[PDB]
Each structure stands twice: as structure tokens, then as C-alpha cells.
Amino acid sequence: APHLVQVDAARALWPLRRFWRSTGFCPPYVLSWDQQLNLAYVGAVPHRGIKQVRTHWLLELVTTLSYNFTHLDGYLDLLRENQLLPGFELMGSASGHFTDFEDKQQVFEWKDLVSSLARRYIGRYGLAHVSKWNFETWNEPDHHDFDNVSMTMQGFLNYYDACSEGLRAASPALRLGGPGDSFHTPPRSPLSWGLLRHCHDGTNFFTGEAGVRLDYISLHRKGARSSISILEQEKVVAQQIRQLFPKFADTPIYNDEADPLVGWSLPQPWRADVTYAAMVVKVIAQHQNLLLAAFPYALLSNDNAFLSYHPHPFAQRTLTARFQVNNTRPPHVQLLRKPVLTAMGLLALLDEEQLWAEVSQAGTVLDSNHTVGVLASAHRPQGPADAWRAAVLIYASDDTRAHPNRSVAVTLRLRGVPPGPGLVYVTRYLDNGLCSPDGEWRRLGRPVFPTAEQFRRMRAAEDPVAAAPRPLPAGGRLTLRPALRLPSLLLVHVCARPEKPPGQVTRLRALPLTQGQLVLVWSDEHVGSKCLWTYEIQFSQDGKAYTPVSRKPSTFNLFVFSPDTGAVSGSYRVRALDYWARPGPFSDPVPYLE
Template sequence: MSVNTVPRQSLAHKMIWLFTFNGRDGLNFSLCSLAMLCIHEASFSPLLGLVVVVLVLLELLRCQLAHRVVKMKELQHQDLLLASPNNTINYTLLSNDNAFLSYHPHPFTQRTLTARFQVNNTRPPHVQLIRKPVLTVMGLLALLGETQVLAQVLNSGRQENSTVGVLASTHRPLIHGGSDSWQAAVLVYNSDDNSTSQLSVCYPGLLYVTYYMDNNVTNPQQLWQSMGSPDFPTAQQFRQLRSVEDPRTDGPQKLPPGDTLTLKAKLSLPSVLLVHVCARPEVGPDQVGKSLRLLDQKVGGLYRVRAVDYWGRAGPYSLPERFSDGE
């Protein structure tokens, strides 16, 4: 299926068609009003399965969490198709826009995972990358286990179509007695109005950590705009931008007595909440290997790292690595 680019100046209408195609239900379309909005062509395109072609999207969505919540819905849609007994779609590969780099003067609003700043007022010039919310959400997805478990959203008698979605999973270690342990993760997202949700998990004697993101907690682009949208942020401004890259983390905390964990969280529009529950491993973390490489062309010296689990147990340090200017 091909889509011709529509020049921006030709979009004089107040109504625009949005098309979705999933290879199964055919082509669906709806008429949307996008009057007075800055629009351009964009797309979501996971390969070998669901294909969603959106002719025009708000440019602002690329740098805020709303676009990332749409990605969560997309993953859940694929998950539902996989769970269907009549599924004939082979999901062996999903594409991702991890190879794109943004360019001046739009570091946050292009189809990238990071905001790229080409800082030319230093000698030598250098590049700084700021993680966008979509990449932070992908980090939360890494906490999901390999086995899906049943999860339901109960609306307590409210509207039939909930604005809250959920993905739940468990992980079991392949080798018992090591630093790995049983884990459960529940990812909750809200794509509409504010609401209060309760989560029930039936595994006693565990620790849990919550990770929360919304457009106020995790929004480097909003902070960058409040700085005056500088082309070349200072070192202090880059430190401030990186301080809002990560989700807000609470915990680790012990599960209360009983077999049910009930959490009450106000989910803003849009927002993502992940609850990560872990059993205590029999031993502490293993030594960090050479998969982590710290590259810094300005600072020289010896570096080493170690892992720390939810129980505060630190593993052995990695072998020292030497770095120097120009290496």
C-alpha cells in the first residue's frame, strides 16, 4: 500500500480522513476535524503484521507521552491478535525507528527516540542526545516477563469502554539458586480522562517498585521550551534535561500482609504506570560484564560498575576499564 505525500500548503480543508489497515479487517476510515492544527504526514509501521497508516498526526505528539501511550495500545492490539485461536499472522519481527536522528531546529518533534543537539559553540563541536519519553517507555517494557498472565480492568460500573489498558506478565528463572528470581510486572496506561485504578496481585512476601510517567513528570521537551528552546543548551541545562528523562520511581516496598496488593494511583492524561514485583533471589547480583561500555572523549581514567538489587545487595564490581581523551 502506497501513500502519496500531501504538501502542507494544500491542507486547506478542516476535515481530514484517517485510514487504518490491518491486513485482515480491510481498510477502515474515519473523518476527523483538525482545524487550526499544525499537521504533517507520519506513520506507524510494524512489519509482518498490523500496519497502521496515519496520513496526518499532530507534530506535538512526537515529543509527548500521548504518542507513547498509542504505542502501548498498539502492542496490546498485537497481543490480542496473537492470543486469538484463529490467528494467522506471524509476528516474528517488529520494526522500530531507532536509526533516525533529529536535526535542527526540531530536536524533539521528529520521528526519533532521542532529541539530538549538535552543539557547535564548543571546541571541538560535539553532539548531545536527550532521551525522549518513547525510549523511556521502552525501558519499562524491558521489565515485562516472557509469560503473559490474565489481567482485567474493572470499571466499577462506569462506562463500558475503559480508558485504562493493562499488560501483565511473569518471569521464572531458568536456573534456580542464582541471582535471578521470580518476577511479575503489570503495565497500566491511561489514554483518556483522569481516573483512579486498583491493582490486585496475589503473591505474598515480595518487594515491589512502581514506575510512573506523564507529561509533567517525564517531559524533557517541556523543560527545554521553558528554557527558551536554546539551540545550544549549556552543561547545566543538559543536566536539568536529563533529570526529567526517567520515570518517577517509588520503592522498593514490601507487600502488605495478605495475598492482595491494592494500589491507588491517579492516572493523568496520558500516563503510564508499571508495577514490578520481585521475589528475593537466593544470592546477590552477578558481576557486570563487558556489555556496558562507557565512552567519553573528554574525561580520562579508570571506570568500573556494579549491580544493586531491590534488597540493596551489591554485586562485585566489573573489571576496570581505562578511557582517555581521543580513545
């Protein structure tokens, strides 16, 4: 039976916070070219769709009583360059200096390392910026991954107090949370429950006062292939925390490894394509609709910024697919944007207020705990460079199971769109048949070292199928009857015309990939409105006569330029193009010489 999706745009219910804008990984490798590319892709999600990168072993990037911060500087600057924040896990031994957190002097030295690093980056980036960072305890303390460090129950508590006092001495404004683990039923997860008991009821190692600061509680709960399982586990743990530790009733809860399945490197066909992408949206929709639409759930992070390894370019839990092309001179690296990363761009279009929506089948109302669901949102405009918007994101997802031999007939009924100037709608659609670079790779015979032409075909499947803007019917109503696949994503974007055109593209740079190829990366931080069709990229060889690069419509703030001719040397400039064909100002031109 067909699915009926109803959306009322006249009816703003409550805030829709973009609580999912995080990723992470575990490693220098963090400063390799591969990683610089990877982080360009992560940062290129439009409208700050990914804000934080939770990174393990950051304090192995420090060496030794004075510290050399060079490698940490390198990594944090690299994040900054892509407008990304560190999920700053205070994790590492500083090249083997720290070995024992029941050695009182080491605990004092740790406190000073932390205040020293916090002050350094307050100085380098400003207090306002570093105050946004989620400083965090050592990852998964109950999984015994400290290599050479001795971390007992008591040691962990000492370590935490050193973290807390270290950050505090740099500035009270800095935020610290933990433990970043599962919180299984006692006697399991002793350090995790032990931290809560310590912060709630224990004694500060340094000051001797009762209890210790804990600005947020971070857990890890993964789905074992079930989307709804993640939320169910979180509610059990959050309830236990609230009831056993009542001081933490309003303490924000993060699930900063909220993945469908544990084991990032385990190859899974469904991780390659829109199956994973659609499921990620489904997980988020379940959290918005079945929880936030109450415990203080504040952040959800898919831990998928890892780089993939041969022979699994697409099938690992990664935002990009890496190809190490070893038969060129020199060898080089190529990354492809996987649908999961593309989906984060679609999620980024969701605006600040949630709209009433209802999914039904044969008269039965279906909540987000079902294969078809929706998130609808609206934007209240501010200035002359802004206007009313609505974004509706519909998912069809059976979690990790793809169903290529199925169609899902949907009827979307949108109403209550208020009157506005030049109202248009734009649909963007994503599925495995049309938008899977893995799908194109398989169709090509899964070449180990794809040719330049093979990469172009693969990259042509990265973006969603976009339909040209169409004027909205009067009365603020629209009915669409798409044949969705399983998995699939469909965003309907409804935009009124802002009085002024888009802002300027900034931070444009040209990075070499290989002979005849480069990556153009830029920022959309000053473009303003989200009603963007694409970014017009222009190339000039002949002094300064500029020619647009024909390509699929894309709002991704990054583009690999690989022209058949190999002619890449010259100058480049980029601008935003809105749904009414109006351009924003061009970026400054950027030269490039091979």
C-alpha cells in the same frame, strides 16, 4: 468515573511474546559519530528490549567481479557491538552496478552478491547468529523508490528469486520475507500482491520449480493518528492473505512500520514526549489483548531510530532527541533519551506469561480499545539466581492527544500473588509533567545550543519516577489508587528475592562527547534477574579509590557523565543493584583520559 484495574497473579493464561522489540530507519551517515551514539542509545534499552534495527539501503554500503564490503562490515559490527541485529533489507545497487532486473545476467549476479554477503557474515558472526536475521526484500516496492534501478513487476519477481536462491546457497537456515508494503485493495499494490502470487503459484526463475520460499510476509500499516486503526487494517489484510493464498495461513506476519502516523520527519508535538510513548504501549497492548491473547502476527516495529534535525530535536518520530552543539570547540553532538525510548525499557520488564487482567469503569468492562488499559505478566523462576516476578504495565493514552488539564483516578487491585521469599513491589511512573526532557527544554526557553547545565536539567527528566521497594502484604494482595495523568505510564513490578545476588555488568566502555563529558555504555547480558533498582556507577581519579556517581535510579544501560567540575579523567566501573540493596560483581575498570 474512576477506572478499576484488576489483575490476578494466580492465573497464567498463555505466553506473552515480546513481539515489539524492533526499530528501523533510512540513511557514510550510518558510520557517523551521531549514528554510533544513536545506536548506543537503542541498544542500551535493558533486557534486550530492542533486538532488531531494520535498515534501508544496506547494499549501497557495498561497492564493486568482486565487492568491497568494508562499509557494510562497519555498520554490522556497530550493531553487533550494541547486541543488535540488522533487519536486513536486500536493498541497493552496489554503487550503481545493478540497473535492470530483467537483464538475466544481473539477476544471476544479484544471487551471487547475496550468497556472497550471507557467507561472509556467517563466517564473521557464525551461522547461529545470522540465522536469526530477518532478511527482507527491497522496501516498499509499490512506492517506486529504486532511484536508478529498473524494477518492473517481472523484475521484482526475478530479484526476489535471486534473493531467495542467494541466501539458500549460503545456508537453507537463513530466513527471507517481504514485500514490506501496504497491500492496498487491487489494482493497487501490484508488486506486493504479485510477490504473493509468485511465491504461492509462480515459477522459480532459477530452478523452474513451482512456487518460491517466503518465510514471512511483511506489511506496512500506519494509524493516521489512531492506535486501533493499525490493528484493524492488519486484520483486513491478514484475512485477505489467508483466504486468497491458503498456503500462507500459518506464515508469520510482520508489521515492520506500524507507526501512529506516516512521515517520520513531520514535526508533531505529541512525538516529543509521553504522548507518543503511552500510545506505543497502547498499540502493543491492543495487539496482545485483542489479537494474540488468531492469525500468525509475529513482529511489530516502530520505525523510529531516525536522527532528528534542527529545528525539531524532539518533535520528529525518533527514539532520541539530537542536539548538534555548534558553538563549542570542536562542535559536538548530544543525544537525549525521549520517553518513547524509556517506555521500551518498561515494556522490556514484561515476562513470558500473560496474567488475567480486567479494566472497568462504572461496572462496564473496557478492552484495550480505550484510553486506559493494562498488560500484566508473570515469570516462572529457574535457578538459584532467579525468582517469581510479575510486571503490570498500565497506560493512559488518548492516542496523539495529550490532556494536561486532566487526572485519571485509577484503582489497581492485584491478587493471587503466590507465597515467596522477600516479596517486594516497585512502581515506576512516567508522564509529561515529571518525565519530559522536551518539557524541560521548553521551560528553558528552547535554547538552540543548550549549555552543559541545561543538558543536565533536560537529562534529569529521562527516567521514570521510581518509588523505593516496599514489602508486599501477606496473602499476595495489593491495592494502589494512583492519580494518573493523560498521557501516562505506570509499571508495578512485584518481585520475590532470588537466593543469589545479580550477575556482572559487561562490555563497559567510555566514549568522549565533549570537554568534561562522556557516555558510559554497558551490557546487562549477564546480570540475570530483572529485579534491578539501578546500576551503581563509580569513578576513581586517586589511583583506585572509587566514588559512586549520585544520579536518578535507572536501569538504562547507558549514562552521560557531565560533572560540574569537568573532572572526567580516571577509571570507571559499574554494577547492578537489586531491590534488596545487594550488588552484583563490578565490571572490569575502564580507564579514560581526555
